[PDB]
Design a protein around this ligand. Structure first.
Ligand SMILES: [Ca+2]
Ligand SMILES: [Ca+2]
Lengths: 96, 96, 48
């Protein structure tokens, strides 16, 4: 119900070469699971509960074809941990 | 040898002396496997959460917690604890 | 969202020796317990 205001100084800046840029700081959203019945639920299934975790155990790989972009996370073993049983793969295997 | 007063899946004898986690099981510490990357843990046999954080001694030691938690806090004596601050970068005044 | 108003007579009083005093009539708050899991809860545990 409340519009986004700017002040007079900012308006004067816009009345020039100056342009507003948009940056996305975060995105909330849900994933789907099946409940005890056959129904798919996406209500309490918050993606932000996994973002930190996935980023901590993964390597980032991004493919840029010029027009499209594809971003991936591939799990990798923790270096010092003897109890980490994540299989080791090469960069080529991970890309494939 | 088999007695868990605090019911945290680590025997009292193991908590008093050293222990480590192998295949999700607490085992009595032996120096023989210090050089394979295992760490010696100690904790209170009367407290399930020695550091007072939301995770038990077993959960921390076994790493069966949020993977974004730093490995320091896998030690039962070191608390899983976020220290969050706010910094101001600039201030904008709109004279109405 | 709503600021605390005073009227003109009160404002005139403040423009003199007169000072506003604060008194605390009560305090609400929670205590901690452990639930069936190891978690500490302080949500329905009213001190009052
Ligand atoms: Ca124990
Ligand atoms: Ca304990």
């Amino acid at each position: 119900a409340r519009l986004i205001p700017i002040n007079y100084d900012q308006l004067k800046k816009l009345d020039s070469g100056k342009q507003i840029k948009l940056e996305t700081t975060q995105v909330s959203g849900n994933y789907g699971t099946k409940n005890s019945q056959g129904q798919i639920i996406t209500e309490g299934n918050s993606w932000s509960n996994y973002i930190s975790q996935i980023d901590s155990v993964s390597a980032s790989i991004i493919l840029d074809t010029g027009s499209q972009t594809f971003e991936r996370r591939v799990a990798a073993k923790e270096q010092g941990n003897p109890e980490d049983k994540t299989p080791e793969i090469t960069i080529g295997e991970a890309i494939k | 040898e088999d007695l868990d007063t605090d019911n945290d899946n680590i025997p009292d004898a193991y908590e008093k002396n050293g222990y480590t986690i192998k295949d999700s099981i607490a085992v009595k510490w032996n120096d023989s496997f210090a050089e394979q990357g295992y760490k010696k843990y100690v904790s209170s046999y009367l407290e399930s959460n020695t550091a007072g954080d939301p995770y038990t001694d077993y959960q921390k030691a076994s790493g069966s917690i949020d993977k974004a938690i730093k490995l320091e806090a896998r030690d039962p004596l070191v608390a899983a604890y976020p220290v969050v601050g706010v910094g101001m970068e600039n201030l904008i005044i709109s004279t109405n």
